Amino acid sequence: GLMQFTLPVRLCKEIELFHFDIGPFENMWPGIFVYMVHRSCGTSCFELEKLCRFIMSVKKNYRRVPYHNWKHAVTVAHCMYAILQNNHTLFTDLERKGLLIACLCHDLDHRGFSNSYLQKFDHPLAALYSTSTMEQHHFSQTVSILQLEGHNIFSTLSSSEYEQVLEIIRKAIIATDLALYFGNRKQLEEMYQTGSLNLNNQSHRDRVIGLMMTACDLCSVTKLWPVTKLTANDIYAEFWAEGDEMKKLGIQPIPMMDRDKKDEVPQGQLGFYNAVAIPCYTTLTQILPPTEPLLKACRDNLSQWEKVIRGEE
Ligand SMILES: Cc1nc(C)c2nc(CCc3nc(N4CCCC4)nn3C)nn2c1C
Ligand SMILES: [Mg+2]
Ligand SMILES: [Zn+2]
Numbered sequence: 001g002l003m004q005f006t007l008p009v010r011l012c013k014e015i016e017l018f019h020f021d022i023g024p025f026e027n028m029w030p031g032i033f034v035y036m037v038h039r040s041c042g043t044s045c046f047e048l049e050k051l052c053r054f055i056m057s058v059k060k061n062y063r064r065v066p067y068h069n070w071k072h073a074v075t076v077a078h079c080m081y082a083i084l085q086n087n088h089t090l091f092t093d094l095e096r097k098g099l100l101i102a103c104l105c106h107d108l109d110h111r112g113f114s115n116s117y118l119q120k121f122d123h124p125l126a127a128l129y130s131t132s133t134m135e136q137h138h139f140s141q142t143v144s145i146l147q148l149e150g151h152n153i154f155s156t157l158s159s160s161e162y163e164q165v166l167e168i169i170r171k172a173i174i175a176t177d178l179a180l181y182f183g184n185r186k187q188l189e190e191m192y193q194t195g196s197l198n199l200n201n202q203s204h205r206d207r208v209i210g211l212m213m214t215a216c217d218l219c220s221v222t223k224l225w226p227v228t229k230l231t232a233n234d235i236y237a238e239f240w241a242e243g244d245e246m247k248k249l250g251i252q253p254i255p256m257m258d259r260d261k262k263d264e265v266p267q268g269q270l271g272f273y274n275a276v277a278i279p280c281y282t283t284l285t286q287i288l289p290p291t292e293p294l295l296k297a298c299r300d301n302l303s304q305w306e307k308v309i310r311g312e313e
Contacts, residue, residue: 001043005031005034005035007031007032011023015035015078016082018082018297019297022074022075026070029070033074034055036081036100037051040084040085050151050155054145055104057145057148058073058145061108061109062108063111065111065238066235066238067235067237067238068110072107073105075220076107079103079216079222080103080212081100083215083291084099084100086288086290087288087290090199094164095205097154097165098172099209101142102142102168102173103213105142106173108137108138108142112241113238113242114134115135117245118134119133125137132177132180135174138173139173139174142169171206171209175209175211175213176214181211181214184214185214185280185283188283188287192283197287208288214280215280215284215291215294218276218277219294221273221277221301222301225300225301228301232269236259236265239257240257240259244259266308267309270302277302278298281298282295
C-alpha cells in the first residue's frame with residue numbers, strides 16, 4: 001500500500017530518458033519494470049503480489065537467445081515508459097496499464113528465428129498461424145500466463161475493460177511484426193499530412209499505438225553508440241544462426257542472415273536506418289512531438305555507421 005519501489009540516484013534520473021540502458025544486472029530488471037508501472041500507471045494499477053508473480057512467469061518464458069531475450073523485453077518496455085511519461089495526457093488508464101504489459105510480453109517464447117524460417121522449416125506454429133506467426137504465438141503465451149493461478153493482474157477490471165485491455169495487448173503485439181509496419185507508417189504519414197488523423201477514431205489510435213510498438217521494438221538504434229553497436233552483434237548472432245539453418249534446409253539465406261557477408265554489416269545498417277528506423281521515428285515525432293529525442297538519437301547512430309564505413313572507426 002505505502003510501498004514505493006525506488007532506484008539508486010543515477011537510475012532514478014536516467015530511467016526518465018529515452019536513451020537509458022537497463023544495465024547488465026538481470027536481478028534489477030523486475031524492479032526497474034515495477035518502478036516504471038508505478039510511476040506510469042499508479043501503485044494501485046496492479047496488486048503487487050500478482051504483478052511480481054506475473055513478471056517472473058514472463059521472465060521464465062523468454063529463452064536464452066542472443067537478442068530476443070528478457071533484456072530486450074524490459075528494454076522495449078522502458079522505451080514505451082519514456083513515450084507514455086512524455087505524452088502523459090494523450091492516453092487512457094487502460095492503455096497505460098496494457099501497453100507496458102504488451103511490451104514485456106511482445107516476444108514471449110521467441111526461439112531466435114524469423115517468421116520466414118518457421119514457414120520454410122514447416123514448424124507447427126506456421127500451420128496454426130499463417131501470418132505474423134511468432135506474434136500470434138507471443139499473444140497466445142501472454143493469455144496463457146494471465147490464466148495461471150495468482151497471475152491475473154487484470155482481475156479487478158470489469159468484464160468489458162478486461163476485454164478492451166486484452167484487445168489493446170493483442171493489437172500492440174501483432175504490430176511488432178515489421179512486415180505490417182511499412183503499410184501502417186504509410187497510412188499514418190498520409191492521414192497526418194491531409195489532417196484526417198483523429199485520435200478519437202479508435203482505428204487511428206490503433207495505428208498510432210502500432211507505430212509506438214515499432215519505435216519501442218527498434219529502440220536499440222536510439223541508444224548511446226556503444227550500446228547500439230554491441231546490441232547489433234547480438235542481433236546478427238541470431239540472424240547468422242538463422243542463415244546457417246536456411247543453408248541446412250538447402251536455401252541461400254538473404255544477405256542479412258549470411259555470416260559470409262559480415263564485411264557488409266555497416267552498409268546493411270545504413271539501409272535499415274534509411275528504410276525502417278529513420279522513417280519510423282520521423283512519423284512518430286510528427287504525431288507525438290515530445291518523442292523527438294528518439295529521432296535525434298537514431299540520426300546520431302546513422303552518422304556513427306557512416307563513420308564506420310569511412311574508416312573513421
Ligand atoms: C534494432 C534493429 N532491429 C532490426 C530488426 C534489425 N535488422 C538489422 C539488420 C539490417 C541489415 N543488415 C543487412 N546486411 C548486413 C550485411 C549484409 C546485409 N541488411 N540489413 C537490412 N539491424 N537491426 C536493428 C539494428
Ligand atoms: Mg518480435
Ligand atoms: Zn521485439
